[PDB]
From Swiss-Prot, chain A:
It comes from Shigella flexneri. InterPro entries: Dimeric_a/b-barrel, DUF1428. It holds the Pfam family DUF1428. It comes from the Bacteria. This is Uncharacterized protein YbaA. The gene is ybaA.
């Protein structure tokens, strides 16, 4: 529910992900993320959001499909995880990597890990 | 099963990834601060702009290649949340019809439907 104190103060750091996912694997992907999400929260994540292409324009210089070298059978996913600080983000990711829960239902990735793009970013505007 | 939740719960997100000259960070922040109130007025739930902090280089793809970033530039990861595609479309149409520090063509942009929000 809306809470202006949490809204104002909670997030300071974001891990952003852009993924190419086979279109027929939408459900598999959603299920994987639904399994991962509570784990990230356990480790200090504030929120995990995964968004499936709806209206993604094609360009000649750059575009979201070019960014993940998307193949004809694939759709672009735009996703992120919100954290209270870089330090919590770092701790969470280290934990995730040492968790057998994501060793299992996590190594069956319904997408090409090589083409995923990823980075940590500091919040500069959040309104 | 609750069809009211099913139909309404998930938000619609316009995602933006932008190459911005590193020396224009404040200019970029103040631009976004100015635009935010207008997007909210038009129906946005939230506007977020994030500046590169730990963005690894890759050989296949990475955030810098995604916006064909130049040596003097950093990557911004940004989004705007809406209740639905319809509000998103209305808000952007208002932006195009109505109102009032980065390489606009290299920016990548798209509308996306949230499928997980936890
Ligand atoms: Na293109
Ligand atoms: Na580490």
């Amino acid at each position: 529910t809306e809470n202006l104190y949490f809204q104002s103060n909670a997030m300071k750091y974001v891990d952003g992900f852009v993924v190419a996912v086979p279109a027929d694997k939408k459900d598999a992907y959603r299920e994987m993320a639904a399994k991962a999400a509570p784990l990230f929260k356990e480790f200090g994540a504030l929120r995990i959001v995964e968004c499936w292409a709806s209206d993604v324009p094609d360009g000649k210089v750059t575009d979201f499909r070019m960014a993940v070298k998307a193949e004809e059978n694939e759709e672009v996913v735009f996703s992120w995880i919100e954290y209270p600080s870089k330090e919590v983000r770092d701790a969470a990711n280290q934990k995730m990597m040492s968790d057998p829960r994501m060793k299992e239902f996590g190594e069956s990735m319904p997408f090409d890990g090589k083409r995923m793009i990823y980075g940590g970013f500091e919040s500069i505007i959040d309104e």
